[PDB]
Amino acid sequence: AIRKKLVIVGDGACGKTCLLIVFSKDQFPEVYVPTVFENYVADIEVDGKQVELALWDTAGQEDYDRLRPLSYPDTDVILMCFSIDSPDSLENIPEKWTPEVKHFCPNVPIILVGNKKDLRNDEHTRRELAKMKQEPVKPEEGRDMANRIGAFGYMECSAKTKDGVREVFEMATRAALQA
Amino acid sequence: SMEMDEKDFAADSWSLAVDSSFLQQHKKEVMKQQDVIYELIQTELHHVRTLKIMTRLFRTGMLEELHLEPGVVQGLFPCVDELSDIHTRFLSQLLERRRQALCPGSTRNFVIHRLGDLLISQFSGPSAEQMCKTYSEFCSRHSKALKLYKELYARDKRFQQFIRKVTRPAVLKRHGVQECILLVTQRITKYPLLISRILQHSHGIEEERQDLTTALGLVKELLSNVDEGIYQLEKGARLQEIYNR
């Protein structure tokens, strides 16, 4: 089992912390949802290869431009996250997060992940966004952003229902193993 | 960590740590506030344990077993004794506030109503000046420590054997040398998230809401000062590379 490092980046509203928590416990917390994530080393077997995948969050570092890059050394795969209930989180991907990750993590594969996919057809979400002349991110808008930023791929998931979560981390492991 | 504190913080939440008959006596808003305060203390206990792995298992083990050149152990573990003193003192204060709040006859049932004043004290005055000085130094030496570790692991056989030996146990799975360094650098930016969530559930007593609002502001001022005081040191970087920053 070779060791690989994963870092998740994105706006605070993207749900990155919840995504790492749900994957690391294989469960959405039923009693208490933690505020923070320390680190974790997941044992993953993908396509017959065993990997130890270290997981790291960047939550809390968004306002600190000299502290935040200390999370990047030796990263093997980046999850670049946005929330489907927030077009604003998707707008911040190409001009803020992408040039930063390309500078500190050259040639590292990026997977663009649309989180909170369960809110795409949620009535309360559609009513709230329509007040700002917005609507949930459509799958083609996510794929087009991934294509534009040079992402390795585009994936969607829901930390609330767990759908798609295992697939995201198995694919990140495959991306981390590539030459 | 010592067994008494590990068992006191073994549960995933305060609501699972206290007796169910005691939990039933409180309103939902109190339970929410206590669950977040319990996460702050539990994660502080784990952070002090990370610093003990760095000082006792790694640093002291290298001094007692290996023949490294002078300045190498300090280069791998910059400021670790100062960081351990800062956080062991803060953890002691948090655990004393919990111990005073215990019901007579219990070692697990408590409610902490006055955390704000403790956080203002930690994040102001001489203790805040020492946290700023220590983290500005540690975080500016972070790249250099990782690079020195990587060079020794790839070139020194006795060093590689030592690291593989002390990191073999399953309890060290998340705590290799580089992992410890980034856990410590990331600790300081977890505080605002935790304090803001405690504050969200502390409106019941206005003096407490005001004290946590003051503490949140002091923590953000400390982080802004540390962030502005960082410049990565690099072994072999010439003066010309520095003054042309």
Ligand SMILES: N#CCc1nccn1CC(F)(F)F
């Ligand atoms: N996290 C990291 C390495 C880093 N720092 C600044 C730039 N880079 C990328 C490079 F090392 F140049 F490839």
